[PDB]
From a paper:
The crystal structure of the ASFV topoisomerase ATPase domain was determined at 2.20 Å resolution in the space group P31, with four ATPase molecules in the crystallography asymmetric unit displaying highly consistent global conformations [root-mean-square deviation (RMSD) value of 0.1 Å for all Cα]. The ASFV ATPase dimer contains a primary interface mainly formed by the side-edge of the GHKL domain and locked by a long N-terminal strap from each monomer, which buries a roughly 2,000 Å2 of molecular surface per subunit. In the structure of ASFV topo II ATPase domain bound to AMPPNP, the nucleotide binds in the active site and engages in an intact pocket mainly formed by the ATP-lid, the N-terminal strap, strands β4−β5 and β9, and helices α2 and α4–α5 of the GHKL domain. Besides, the QTK loop from the transducer domain also contributes to the pocket by making a hydron bond (Q366) and a critical salt bridge (K368) with the γ-phosphate of AMPPNP. As seen in the previous study, a single Mg2+ ion was observed in the active site, which is octahedrally coordinated by each oxygen of the three phosphates of AMPPNP, the side chain of N64, and two water molecules bridged by D67 and E60. Among the residues involved in AMPPNP binding, E60 is supposed to act as a catalytic base that activates the water molecule to allow nucleophilic attack of the γ-phosphate, while K368 stabilizes the transition state of ATP hydrolysis reaction. In the ASFV topo II ATPase domain, the apex portion (residues 133–138) of the ATP-lid flips outward and close to the transducer domain, whereas in the yeast topo II ATPase domain, this region (residues 131–136) is close to the active site.
Structural comparison reveals that the ASFV topo II ATPase domain shares a conserved overall structure with its homologs from eukaryotes and prokaryotes but also has three characteristic regions, including the intra-molecular interface formed by the ATP-lid and QTK loop as well as helix α9, the K-loop in the transducer domain, and the antennae-like α-helix at the ATP binding domain.
Residue numbers in the entry:
A (entry chain A), B (entry chain D): 1 to 335, 341 to 403
Amino acid sequence: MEAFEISDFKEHAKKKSMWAGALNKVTISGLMGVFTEDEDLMALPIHRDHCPALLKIFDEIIVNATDHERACHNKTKKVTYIKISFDKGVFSCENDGPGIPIAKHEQASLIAKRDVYVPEVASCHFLAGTNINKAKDCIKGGTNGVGLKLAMVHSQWAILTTADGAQKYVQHINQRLDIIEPPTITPSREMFTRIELMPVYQELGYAEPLSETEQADLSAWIYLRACQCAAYVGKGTTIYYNDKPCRTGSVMALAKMYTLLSAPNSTIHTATIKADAKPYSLHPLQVAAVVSPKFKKFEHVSVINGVNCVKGEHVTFLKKTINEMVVKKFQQTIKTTLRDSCSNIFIVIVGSIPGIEWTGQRKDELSIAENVFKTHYSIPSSFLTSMTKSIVDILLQS
Amino acid sequence: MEAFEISDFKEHAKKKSMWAGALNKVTISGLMGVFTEDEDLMALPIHRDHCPALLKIFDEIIVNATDHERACHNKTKKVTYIKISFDKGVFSCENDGPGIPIAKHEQASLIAKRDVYVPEVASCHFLAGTNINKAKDCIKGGTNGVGLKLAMVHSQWAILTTADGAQKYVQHINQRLDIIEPPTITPSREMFTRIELMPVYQELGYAEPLSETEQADLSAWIYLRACQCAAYVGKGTTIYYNDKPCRTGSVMALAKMYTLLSAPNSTIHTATIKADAKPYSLHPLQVAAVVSPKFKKFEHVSVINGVNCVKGEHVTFLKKTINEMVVKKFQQTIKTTLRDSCSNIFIVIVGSIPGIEWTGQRKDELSIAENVFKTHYSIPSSFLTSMTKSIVDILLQS
Ligand SMILES: Nc1ncnc2c1ncn2[C@@H]1O[C@H](COP(=O)(O)OP(=O)(O)NP(=O)(O)O)[C@@H](O)[C@H]1O
Ligand SMILES: Nc1ncnc2c1ncn2[C@@H]1O[C@H](COP(=O)(O)OP(=O)(O)NP(=O)(O)O)[C@@H](O)[C@H]1O
Ligand SMILES: [Mg+2]
Ligand SMILES: [Mg+2]
C-alpha cells in the first residue's frame, strides 16, 4: 500500500520515541534538578512538563564521558576531568584522557566511497562503537553504539573535537546529521574529547531562545546529573558544571542534597556492599539512606554504571533485606507490609554492576536475576541494624 | 581501535537488550500467567526467572493482530478472530481481515536487486511498516516497523502466510533472519495473516525441548495475554488460545480473574471514563477496581492501545483523583498519604489513548502530559464515591 514505507535511521530517530523517549514535552515522574540556596546544594522537584529526548541528548554525552573515565581509570593515561557547560542553550562536554582514535576507517570508507575517519563513525554511524561486543564484566553504561548519534540527530549544529596525542580532529555535524562536513586534521600532541552542540529546542517544544523558566529548569537538571557523576567516578576525576567543581563526591553528599529541605540535620546510615567473588568483588556498592517520618513514600536515587536508572532489582535487594529485619524487630515489641517499613526510607545507591542488561536505549530499567545479590552480595549488618532501629521507632510512634 | 565496529540490524538485535529486553533469564517483577482451577480462570504470579525478549516475540505478533483489528473495526472487511497457539514450543498467531498486500515493493526490490514483495519487507526489513508516519490520533500500538523483525530474528524457523483475496503468499524465514526463502505465490480468495515460528529457546536460556515447568509457565503467560486482548478488542472479535475461546470480554472479567485467589466474591467498582472532545471522545476508557484489606500494595493492570504496559500517567490520573476524595471523606470522620487510600486498590484499565509516546520498543511505559486527563477526561462520580466509601471503611478499621 501507499502507507507501507522504509525509513533510514536518522529520519526514524527524529520521529520515534523508542530511541530517547518522547520528542515533545510530557510529564516526567520524579523529575528533579539542583538549586543553590545560600551556598547549600538542594535537590528540588521540577513540576513542569519537559521533553525526555532533550534530556537524553545531555545524558548520552555525559555517560560517554564517565564511560571513558571507567575505561582508563587503571591505565597510565587516565581521565582527570569532565567539564560540562550549558549557556545560551549551547551544551558542551569535555574529558581528557585518550581521544577517539584519529584514523581512517576502512570499512566505513569503502561503504561511503570516501575517506571516513573513526570519530565520524563514532558520531554519525548508527550501531557503531567499541561496545558492540561488550564483555560480561564490562561496567560501561554504553553498549549499543547509538547514544552519540542520537545527540547529533537532535542538534541544529554540533562540533566534535578530539586529539590523540599526535593530531587534533575537528568536525562539524549539522542539521540533525543531514550535513557532515569533512574533518580538519592538524598536528597537536593534545589529548581530549569535546562535544559541543545546539539542540533543536523549538522542534522539541521549547521557546526558540529558551524561556527563563526553561533555561533555569534545564540548567538545574544538568547540574544535578553532574553531581550524580561526581559521586560515581573514580578518585582521580573532578566533575565541573559551568566551570565550578561539583561537591558531591560521595553518597553521603548526595543523600544530604536530596533531603536538605525534607529533613535537614538528619542521620545518614552508610554501607559499602561488597561481594565475595569476581567480577562482582571488583565493584563495591556505596549506599547512604535517611529515615524520617516526614518522608511519605519510599524513594531511591540509583547511579549504576554511570546511568541514573530508576528501576532495578538492586533496589529490591535492599528493600526486601531491610523489610525482613524490620518485621522481626517490630514483632518483638508488639508480640506490616514491604511498603510499610520502607515508606520512610530515602536511599542513594551508587556503583558498578557487571553483567546487567537494559530495557531500552534510555536505560531506565536494568535487568538481572535477583539471585545475583542473594548469592554474591552481603549488606553490612551494622547498616541493617541501625536502619531497622530507626524504622521501628517510627512505626511504634503511630 | 580494534574494538571499533559497525554492526547491522540483525546481529545487533541478537546481542543487545535495547530491542526487546534481556536476552537471558532475569527476574521479571510482577510476572503473571493464567492457570485453570476447576473451570475458573485465575491469574497467579510466576516466581521464576524468564527471558523478557522471548515474551516479546509473542507480544509483538499479538499486538500486530490487535492493531489490525482496530484498523478494520469500522471497515466493511473486519477482523473477526485472533487465534493464538502454543504447542511443542511452536508459536503461531492468525487473524482474518485483509491480508498483507501481496505486491512487489519497487524500492525494496531496487535495493536488493531482486523481486521483493511487501510481506517480505513487513517481516524482514528493519524500520519498515505502515506506521512510520503515524498520525497523532492513531491508536495502534505499532509504530516503529521493528516488532515483527524482532520475532523473526529470534526464530530458528518461521513461516509467514498471508492471503489478500487475490492471492496467497507463503514464505519461509529461517535461522534468525539469515535465510529468507523466496515466496510461493498462488491464486486464492482467502483473506488472513498467519505467523508460525519456533523461537531459539536454548539461546535465550531454556531447555532445548522446553522443560515441563518452562512450558507450563510460558503457556500460562500467553494465555493471560490472550485474555487481556479479549478485553481490549472490539465487540466483533473472538480471541482463541490453543482453540479455546478466551472468556474475559470485559474489565470486570479481568478484575475477577486477577482477584479470585486473594479476594473472591468481592464487589467490582466499574467506570467508563469519557472525554469531551475528539480524538479523545472516540476512545472511552473501561475501568474495574476491587478494594480489599487483604491487598498489600496498590496494583494495576493496563491494556492501552492493545499493549500491556506497566507505567503511565493514566494510572496516576486515577490514583490522584481517588486520593483527593479519600482525604476529604477521611478527615470528616477523624476531624493520609497517596500510598494510603490507594494501598488497598486493584484496578484494571483498558482502552485506547490517542497521541501517546513510548519510552522504548518494549512499550513498558507510555508518555503524555498529565493535563491531557485533567482537561479532557471525567471519572464518573458514582465510581469515585463508592471507591472512596470502600477505602474509608478500611482506613477507619485500623
Ligand atoms: N567522550 C568520549 N571519549 C572517548 N571515546 C568516546 C567518547 N564518546 C564516545 N566515544 C566513542 O564513541 C563510540 C560511540 O559512542 P556511542 O554512540 O554513545 O555508543 P556507546 O557509548 O558505545 N553505546 P550507547 O551509548 O549505549 O548507544 C563509543 O563506543 C566510544 O568508542
Ligand atoms: N497481523 C497482521 N495483519 C496485517 N498487517 C500486519 C500484521 N502484522 C504486521 N502487519 C504489517 O506489517 C508491518 C510491519 O510490522 P511490525 O514490524 O510489527 O511494525 P509495526 O507494527 O508497524 N511497528 P512496531 O511493532 O512498533 O515495531 C505493520 O506496520 C503492518 O503494516
Ligand atoms: Mg554511549
Ligand atoms: Mg508491530
